[model samples]
Target: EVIEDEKQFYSKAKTYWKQIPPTVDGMLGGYGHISSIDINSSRKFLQRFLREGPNKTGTSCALDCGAGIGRITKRLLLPLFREVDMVDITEDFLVQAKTYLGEEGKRVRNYFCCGLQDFTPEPDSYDVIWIQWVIGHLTDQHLAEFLRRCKGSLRPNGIIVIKDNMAQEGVILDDVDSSVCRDLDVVRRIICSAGLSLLAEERQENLPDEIYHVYSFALR
Candidate 1:
């Protein structure tokens, strides 16, 4: 939604965004690659959530927060849910998602190209809410606030699946340009403090050197 300059943006997209490889080491190539990894990791977490079921049953709605280009959203939600609502901060990313996700993309019941802090869904509306790699971008205070906001969007016994590049041992942090990348414990605390209970967690070693932590939790 924020396009400061078309030429500059397009130029960066060509040199940085589009050329990125979908691997953990190729992260600097673009947001696409990083997003891809996050989404793929989310698939594992989602499988666990589905198999375990939320606290309640028969609720069909799901939400994909910060759905960049529909990569993780398509992999984890489309086939499983009857309907999904996708939200993002960039219109271009959503447009690209539409191109790839096709009919399901068109079937998106709701789409918002705005910051997650400003977006709100109906209370207790979704059975599952999938948030992948979006929290790392927020400041600590905002991250806590964001989790609190998402609390009301869940159906009773609903769960939230979070897949992110966690700060694990022997992992290199050079690729990620943030100190928060090493704060998985803090993130877990934030989720628990927001009235969610951690139901499951897994760590996957990707690309020989990178490890990602995926967590699944339910409303308290």
Candidate 2:
């Protein structure tokens, strides 16, 4: 029954995010303490492909999808990528991102306010596109199509990384957030259908056990 009404699904999420304070804690749903751990693991996962190799990914530019207050951008991306761009559904978050990022905010090239379902990345414009924790808000078809669009946005040897919550089994809808958590198999299926290869996959470790299992996928 999740996303039966696509408009409601998106609008509900928009309303939910709008009221939430623009802070790391709010971005993380009160698990702000884990932000360091999450960013550390993400950096390690990304560094492997950024190394000096034939298949190395570039450090020139990156786009953060579903970026809220530049959480990952400030910690994980800005430190590595020469320039970063952020896109989120909430305008307030983007406004807060500039101040929250402090001096580093200058490195951010653009702050775009748009939903993932309706947003399009400039073609062949990014070295790495990092999308985390927001796919659940998109319907299955939209998710696949967005990924297809992301594929066109990549530079040579570029990759798109998705770090998100994974349901233990089938899809589970969270009314509080107006999102759906999909199992690994379903997520992989969507990726395959999008014509993207799953270069690597790993389970994020040491998160609070009360939350859903989180997995990161490195795709090309």
Candidate 3:
């Protein structure tokens, strides 16, 4: 198991992220240049479910999990949802977000500072929940449980999306930051365990080949 000591595992990542500067590059491990490309592609992917239809997801509210400096919230959620909420483990990031988001920050409904493992979304309150690039910090069990909570928070036709790196095989641990990258199937299993059905899945395009493959899944 990659996380033999769960307490230490979470603490190590907390420390690592605390030391990171509150900037776009800091949130992305210094690959700030990819921010625009990543956002552009994510926007296109999310728009599929937002189109007008009886089953279309509502645009009333969204929750951005692990929203460091509100990067995704500012460009993605705020523009699409009537109100956006952000949650992160690191308080510094959330603080920086207040300023980084500029005028549109006023539209943000909440800036929650807590880890996803412990944070619970309000029941039946969100139209969409976007969890990007942060699942590695969660254990398989915690992630499954968290997703279950998220499922309960969804409105009618609501969706939860996870966009993260996928290992080629098995779980790979990163000691530097204390995270585990699991293979795609492993993630799918966790999603299924949460009793959420997959609505759609897609691979991120135009990413640097050096990074692990990134995929996004829409579930409810």
Candidate 4:
């Protein structure tokens, strides 16, 4: 199910991609092609992050935070991890993810539909926590709390991959929106405040004109 904010963007995307919007039934994000591209890019970021050695084997246990329709979870993380835990705030999305992953869904060790702040994960249980494009949906306080909790779930030298769009310096806003997406500096501060060390960082600025900012962070 496509979120309302994404509806317009997906509609515009359909024109160029020649596919129906993600809102259409039986079509998750326009024939799943464009979704795959976004997921692939996010995965590459994770692959690079892992290649840096926090968890080099790719067989480590992983948790897919806010796994929306398993876009990146099914397309990328499934192939790399021996087991995956898909966490989301909505069960319907998890159901869709399960369906999309099919037989590979059996590899899903667990699924939780709850807010990241309240969710409790096993201590030192996962090797890699994939947080692709999820932090922008959280408030600064909540983001910090979430990272703190993640620290408990990570094993020694575990890593967290954060990929999302950041607010640029000159973006105008009439009022502060809790739902407003985050910027790079804000995100970096939260991670460092939570006691995580920056492992790697990369930015993709060549996106079509519509996408003003996109970045990936590998933190341990």
Candidate 5:
């Protein structure tokens, strides 16, 4: 069933693949309506998480799931984690991500060409796992299953950071890309069902109300 969902999502990615490339930190909502304002808000939250939550000093590794052109990895994970690995469903994105990484590409442990459902990091392989903007295509079942896999991948004191839009009511069927925007409660319930703890959470600021609300969750 996860594979089935992955197929539909993969096709849609192919259709919109060229459109999501990483540009400057902000401007015209580089990918979808995602703005620097939105990203910086999440950055501020992470600053608090780092200060108040676990202590990640010395060598730390991170996994950037659905990493498009290394956008999230470049802005956040690169400066934070000692080592970072990026995975995307498409090779073109990986190519661009590596290019974006440039000299920092050396810090990239691996460039994986696979989707989340099938990409399994070796157990205890990462200090952080990041998923944003692109986790919406999975079915509820697949989303839970994906989180289950992620739980086993975390290093000691590791955490998962998720940033996604919440549906106002039920779910928004984004026909443009065949993606679903799940209700906030639905996402919370799904994460809970995966047996993960929600340690900290934040809502984005300075964005349109009609658009899906932005949220950041820290899970262990």
Candidate 6:
């Protein structure tokens, strides 16, 4: 676990948008308003994976990892899943996350205040585990092992959704906030090392840049 960096950076990073509107547009610093293309792309890919996998009809739950103020759950997962488990390392973010859910907040089953490296999810329980924008906190070894640890965290045919910044080339580590920008190949290597298989993946359509992509996967 990245105790020193995660602790120092995220505690402050959680407040980046203090008292700001909890919308998708409000979350990303650089954008004012952008296409729903990335969100929709992820939705389509998950539907495709579920359609092919069994257990699509049973009760479903999702885990919103790095759930900054629960934005992803409120904006995306409310209608799609029975409930969401909002997990974030920053206590400030988790507390604010509870407030952002609106009435759909009722759909959330838990609010976890622990980093991905330290948290242990219940076995065979989740239908989708959505991680976006914040995986840069861990090192390559921890990221791989973290994925490896999640092997039993999902129900049969369950999947993991990942959307993050991608470097055009290799790794780029940010000394400012301690973020690590990984290229597509590095991301693939980490996923494979964790024993996950690529179920389906596509670049986010209508993105302003061409470098980053959203990748979705399932357990082998």
**Predicted candidate 5 versus true structure: per-residue lDDT over 127-210, tens digit per residue:** 788888777766787788999999998887788889988877777777666577877898999999999999888888788766
Better candidate by lDDT, 1 or 5: 5
Tell me which of candidates 4 and 6 scores higher on TM-score.
Answer: 6
The per-prediction tally of clashing pairs is: 0, 0, 0, 1, 0, 0
Give one digit per residue, the lDDT tens place, for model 1 in 120-185.
777878888777656555545556677787778777667776665576553223322322353557
Per-residue CA lDDT of model 6 for 1-220, tens digit only, reads 3245555655554454355555445555446365356567666766765664565623388888877677678767877889889887666666766676777798899989877877888988887888877777776777888787676798876777777777777677665455777788888899898888876666666766633554444443
Name the runs in model 5 displaced over 4 angstroms.
1-10, 18-35, 52-59
Model 3 lDDT at residue 31: 88
Q: Candidates' lDDT values, in order?
A: 0.61, 0.93, 0.93, 0.67, 0.75, 0.70
Kindly list the per-residue Cα lDDT of model 3 for residues 4-123, writing each as its tens digit. Answer: 879999999999998999999999988899889989999999888998777999999999999999999998889888899999999999899989999999999998988999999999
Q: What's the CA error at residue 137 for candidate 3, in Å?
A: 0.2
Give the TM-score of each candidate.
0.72, 0.98, 0.98, 0.77, 0.86, 0.82
Model 6 misplaced regions, further than 4 Å: 1-26, 52-59, 210-220
Worst 10 residues of 1 by lDDT: 170-179
Q: Which one wins by TM-score: 4 or 5?
A: 5
- Whichever of 2 and 4 has more lDDT, that candidate is 2
Q: Considering only N, C-alpha and C atoms within 3 Å, which residue pairs clash in candidate 2?
A: none
lDDT for 36 (candidate 5): 58
The C-alpha local distance difference test score for the whole of candidate 4 amounts to: 0.67
Q: What is residue 136's positional error in candidate 3, in angstroms?
A: 0.2
Pairwise TM-score winner, candidates 3 and 6 = 3
Query: Would you list the clashing residue pairs of candidate 3?
Result: none
Tell me how candidate 2 scores on lDDT.
0.93
**What shift in Å separates residue 140 of candidate 1 from its native position after superposition?**
1.1
Cα deviation of 77 in candidate 2 (Å)?
0.4
